[PDB]
Design an enzyme around this catalytic site. Structure first.
Site, mmCIF file in Angstrom:
data_model
loop_
_atom_site.group_PDB
_atom_site.id
_atom_site.type_symbol
_atom_site.label_atom_id
_atom_site.label_comp_id
_atom_site.label_asym_id
_atom_site.label_seq_id
_atom_site.Cartn_x
_atom_site.Cartn_y
_atom_site.Cartn_z
ATOM 1 N N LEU A 1 -12.501 6.859 3.812
ATOM 2 C CA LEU A 1 -13.088 6.577 5.120
ATOM 3 C C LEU A 1 -14.180 5.474 5.050
ATOM 4 O O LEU A 1 -14.759 5.269 3.981
ATOM 5 C CB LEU A 1 -13.660 7.873 5.597
ATOM 6 N N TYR A 2 -14.497 4.712 6.096
ATOM 7 C CA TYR A 2 -15.495 3.678 5.920
ATOM 8 C C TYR A 2 -16.682 4.148 6.694
ATOM 9 O O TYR A 2 -16.521 4.680 7.780
ATOM 10 C CB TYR A 2 -15.240 2.337 6.559
ATOM 11 N N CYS B 1 0.830 -1.180 0.000
ATOM 12 C CA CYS B 1 0.000 0.000 0.000
ATOM 13 C C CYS B 1 0.870 1.237 0.000
ATOM 14 O O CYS B 1 0.574 2.302 -0.558
ATOM 15 C CB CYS B 1 -0.818 0.079 1.205
ATOM 16 N N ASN C 1 0.760 5.567 9.478
ATOM 17 C CA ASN C 1 1.668 5.691 8.355
ATOM 18 C C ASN C 1 2.437 6.982 8.363
ATOM 19 O O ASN C 1 3.597 7.003 7.953
ATOM 20 C CB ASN C 1 0.920 5.591 7.108
ATOM 21 N N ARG D 1 -0.988 4.192 -2.433
ATOM 22 C CA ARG D 1 -2.055 4.018 -3.408
ATOM 23 C C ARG D 1 -3.463 3.831 -2.879
ATOM 24 O O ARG D 1 -4.450 3.908 -3.624
ATOM 25 C CB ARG D 1 -1.786 2.803 -4.329
HETATM 26 C C1 LIG Z 1 0.252 0.178 8.692
HETATM 27 C C2 LIG Z 1 -0.805 -0.013 9.237
HETATM 28 C C3 LIG Z 1 -2.004 -0.318 10.046
HETATM 29 N N1 LIG Z 1 -2.542 -1.711 9.885
HETATM 30 C C4 LIG Z 1 -2.330 -2.452 8.583
HETATM 31 C C5 LIG Z 1 -3.455 -2.526 7.563
HETATM 32 C C6 LIG Z 1 -3.560 -3.708 6.734
HETATM 33 C C7 LIG Z 1 -4.758 -4.042 6.070
HETATM 34 C C8 LIG Z 1 -5.864 -3.172 6.216
HETATM 35 N N2 LIG Z 1 -7.037 -3.466 5.621
HETATM 36 C C9 LIG Z 1 -8.148 -2.651 5.782
HETATM 37 N N3 LIG Z 1 -9.350 -3.003 5.243
HETATM 38 N N4 LIG Z 1 -8.052 -1.498 6.485
HETATM 39 C C10 LIG Z 1 -6.907 -1.117 7.081
HETATM 40 O O1 LIG Z 1 -6.884 0.095 7.774
HETATM 41 C C11 LIG Z 1 -5.780 -1.967 6.992
HETATM 42 C C12 LIG Z 1 -4.578 -1.655 7.657
HETATM 43 C C13 LIG Z 1 -3.205 -2.352 10.956
HETATM 44 C C14 LIG Z 1 -3.327 -3.781 11.052
HETATM 45 C C15 LIG Z 1 -4.022 -4.379 12.154
HETATM 46 C C16 LIG Z 1 -4.606 -3.583 13.186
HETATM 47 C C17 LIG Z 1 -5.198 -4.194 14.396
HETATM 48 O O2 LIG Z 1 -6.415 -4.395 14.620
HETATM 49 N N5 LIG Z 1 -4.327 -4.607 15.312
HETATM 50 C C18 LIG Z 1 -3.840 -3.703 16.371
HETATM 51 C C19 LIG Z 1 -4.981 -3.374 17.368
HETATM 52 C C20 LIG Z 1 -4.689 -2.299 18.484
HETATM 53 C C21 LIG Z 1 -5.171 -0.811 18.278
HETATM 54 O O3 LIG Z 1 -6.267 -0.621 17.676
HETATM 55 O O4 LIG Z 1 -4.455 0.137 18.727
HETATM 56 C C22 LIG Z 1 -2.736 -4.498 17.052
HETATM 57 O O5 LIG Z 1 -1.570 -4.113 16.931
HETATM 58 O O6 LIG Z 1 -3.065 -5.550 17.631
HETATM 59 C C23 LIG Z 1 -4.483 -2.182 13.092
HETATM 60 C C24 LIG Z 1 -3.802 -1.578 12.008
HETATM 61 C C1 LIG Z 2 -2.556 -1.303 2.822
HETATM 62 C C2 LIG Z 2 -1.482 -2.117 3.516
HETATM 63 C C3 LIG Z 2 -1.029 -1.603 4.833
HETATM 64 O O1 LIG Z 2 0.071 -1.900 5.342
HETATM 65 N N1 LIG Z 2 -1.917 -0.686 5.475
HETATM 66 C C4 LIG Z 2 -3.009 -0.009 4.842
HETATM 67 O O2 LIG Z 2 -3.451 1.094 5.208
HETATM 68 N N2 LIG Z 2 -3.568 -0.692 3.739
HETATM 69 C C5 LIG Z 2 -5.059 -0.770 3.601
HETATM 70 C C6 LIG Z 2 -5.534 0.019 2.396
HETATM 71 C C7 LIG Z 2 -7.001 -0.388 2.243
HETATM 72 O O3 LIG Z 2 -7.790 0.174 3.321
HETATM 73 C C8 LIG Z 2 -6.886 -1.894 2.430
HETATM 74 C C9 LIG Z 2 -6.289 -2.618 1.193
HETATM 75 O O4 LIG Z 2 -6.644 -1.927 -0.053
HETATM 76 P P1 LIG Z 2 -7.082 -2.740 -1.320
HETATM 77 O O5 LIG Z 2 -8.513 -3.120 -1.239
HETATM 78 O O6 LIG Z 2 -6.317 -3.966 -1.426
HETATM 79 O O7 LIG Z 2 -6.912 -1.941 -2.530
HETATM 80 O O8 LIG Z 2 -5.911 -2.001 3.550
#
Ligand SMILES: C#CCN(Cc1ccc2[nH]c(N)nc(=O)c2c1)c1ccc(C(=O)N[C@@H](CCC(=O)O)C(=O)O)cc1
Ligand SMILES: *c1cc(=O)[nH]c(=O)n1[C@H]1C[C@H](O)[C@@H](COP(=O)(O)O)O1
Ligand SMILES: C#CCN(Cc1ccc2[nH]c(N)nc(=O)c2c1)c1ccc(C(=O)N[C@@H](CCC(=O)O)C(=O)O)cc1
Ligand SMILES: *c1cc(=O)[nH]c(=O)n1[C@H]1C[C@H](O)[C@@H](COP(=O)(O)O)O1
Lengths: 316, 316
Positions: free
Chosen positions: B260-261, B198, B229, B218
């Site tokens: 945003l969702y 991403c 990020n 992206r």
């Molecule tokens: C880069 C980036 C962010 N990312 C990566 C990432 C990957 C795929 C995604 N996919 C989607 N649909 N939305 C996102 O925002 C998203 C973000 C995250 C990944 C997991 C958690 C999560 O629930 N775990 C935390 C919970 C604790 C908290 O809420 O503070 C954990 O560490 O356990 C949060 C952010």
């Molecule tokens: C991409 C990967 C990561 O480490 N953290 C992110 O913020 N994401 C997000 C972007 C989007 O909300 C979703 C993946 O996007 P896509 O549907 O695959 O295009 O997770």
């Protein structure tokens, strides 16, 4: 009107711009990080404040979309943008036994019979390239250009990935993703390339019914290259759209180093006293559908009224 | 103060944002094309209007810079961001003979004993990953993450290209180019990846004495991922700079789809009634020089005063 993005970034630089030393040693004025967008419903982004030639623009993009990486298409199409490039592999080898056009670059310009001799030797490269099949073959093939990047990316296992093609189809099939990205930056080839892609990546996007595109450029000449780069990326957006049955929303241009050269300040100033006239219009042959099938004629630009073309001291 | 970029883009979206259907079927609100910049001399860009945890941030970036692609480092470092990912290769194979955590995703959330059983089976993956050398080996290795992208890009001829390392040195050596780009997008691997990068590309740049960086993203989650990020890319800019003997100018964040969702609108609204407090500060262990040598302790964040953390309904 539509090109004001361009006049505003030119203001930015010669005002807020902080000088930066350079590769062909005439300093520049640089800003870093910059975005601007042009809404392709109001018209097409070519500039009315300076002549920008849509024929070279056109031939060049069309060569990109054929996968072509050979200047023979460009030379029989009165395009010479890329000449020097291949003439630079010619002059350094086994074969070049002629009147040394070595280092020819600024050497052509502020130097002696590098008006003729240089410019007379190009007839030789550009003739043989048009005729000798065995010549273009090798010396007029330009290896790694946007063609191989866009339609034959090189993988480990021999294969060629048409990442632009795949993309366009991905669009018709899943119009709503974040994943319509074509990268022209491949790290293993980057190390040793004369010019590695300046137009670095682009993202496509379907709006609600409209296509948009976003180009990330890493290094960008404001007076000389930028006018052009806008029209080629707005053409691409019209072309991909006519293909998927779509309306045109915006082209967005994001910059890494946008920069003006000291060679060019009196001249952009001059642009600047003009006040933009109406934006031109684009008609695409509606019969033909399938952009890789399009050809010179199938793309008309209606109602373009240019201010005179300002004379470009290049850099080197 | 410094995080206003973030509040302004959140305004943008829930106001100018036009809905877009999605991959895990809860609609979003999307804009396309967006840049914002944070001047790292005024302080560090973590948000005072919501708790954002700098420990997970930290552990995660440090795993990136070791070339590590194995969650064992993250799990002995109280980080779990990436767990589900590898637990998803575990549950679908030869080995998984247990209580079916299959499709576990929203299934965990608004569904039955997917509070325990799911969340009790992770102990098993995360224990074995910490202990069985033969386990992490294989199931805790996560293949293609930012580690292989940043430090072992895969070429045709077997070799590994440390494109981040090469870059950092390129910086000390030729600080003024346009060419400090690390790409995390490789087209042949992209086709078949669960989440392909991403955080797509970034450009470094030396100002006059200052380092700057620009991240092209992206696809970007405004409430959940974006806070984060920002702090990881501002950390990288402090880290690369301490290494080359430099001052910190800005981090610039350019967006492809920022979105945003609907799951998240009442909650960003809530962020929004708070008014940003002072920006925190960063002290890096000054003795150690060489960022790949740094470790948890060597990076302190001084004077951070957070507004309470808003509860995240994820999507799926
Ligand atoms: C880069 C980036 C962010 N990312 C990566 C990432 C990957 C795929 C995604 N996919 C989607 N649909 N939305 C996102 O925002 C998203 C973000 C995250 C990944 C997991 C958690 C999560 O629930 N775990 C935390 C919970 C604790 C908290 O809420 O503070 C954990 O560490 O356990 C949060 C952010
Ligand atoms: C991409 C990967 C990561 O480490 N953290 C992110 O913020 N994401 C997000 C972007 C989007 O909300 C979703 C993946 O996007 P896509 O549907 O695959 O295009 O997770
Ligand atoms: C993309 C892009 C632009 N590009 C490519 C490109 C490649 C390397 C660069 N290098 C540098 N230092 N500055 C640039 O602006 C630049 C631009 C161009 C390449 C050649 C000419 C040129 O002198 N030939 C034109 C002259 C006619 C005219 O001025 O109208 C020709 O077609 O013959 C112009 C633009
Ligand atoms: C890149 C390639 C192209 O097709 N057209 C361009 O505008 N350029 C420019 C950018 C810059 O002015 C110069 C090359 O930049 P760098 O010194 O290699 O970083 O040509």
């Amino acid at each position: 009107m539509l090109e004001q993005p361009y006049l505003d970034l030119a203001k930015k630089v010669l005002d807020e711009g902080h000088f930066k030393p350079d590769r062909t040693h005439t300093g520049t004025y640089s800003i870093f990080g910059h975005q601007m967008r042009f809404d392709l419903s109001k018209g097409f982004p070519l500039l009315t404040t300076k002549k920008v030639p849509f024929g070279l623009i056109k031939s060049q993009l069309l060569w990109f979309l054929h996968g072509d990486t050979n200047i023979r298409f460009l030379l029989q199409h009165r395009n010479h943008i890329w000449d020097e490039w291949a003439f630079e592999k010619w002059v350094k080898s086994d074969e070049y036994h002629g009147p040394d056009m070595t280092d020819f670059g600024h050497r052509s310009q502020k130097a002696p019979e590098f008006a003729a001799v240089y410019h007379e030797e190009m007839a030789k490269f550009d003739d043989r390239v048009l005729h000798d099949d065995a010549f273009a073959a090798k010396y007029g093939d330009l290896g790694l250009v946007y063609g191989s990047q866009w339609r034959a990316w090189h993988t480990s296992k021999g294969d060629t990935i048409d990442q632009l093609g795949d993309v366009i189809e991905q669009i018709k099939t899943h119009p709503y993703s974040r994943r319509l990205i074509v990268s022209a930056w491949n790290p293993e080839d980057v190390p040793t390339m004369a010019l590695p892609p300046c137009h670095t990546l682009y993202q496509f996007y379907v709006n609600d019914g409209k296509l948009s595109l976003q180009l990330y450029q890493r290094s960008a000449d404001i007076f000389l290259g930028v006018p052009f780069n806008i029209a080629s990326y707005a053409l691409l957006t019209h072309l991909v759209a006519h293909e998927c049955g779509l309306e045109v929303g915006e082209f967005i241009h994001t910059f890494g180093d946008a920069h003006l050269y000291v060679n060019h300040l009196d001249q952009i100033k001059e642009q600047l006293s003009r006040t933009p006239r109406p934006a031109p219009t684009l008609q695409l042959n509606p019969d033909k559908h399938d952009i890789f099938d399009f050809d010179m004629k199938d793309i008309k630009l209606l109602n373009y009224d240019p201010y005179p073309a300002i004379k470009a001291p290049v850099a080197v």
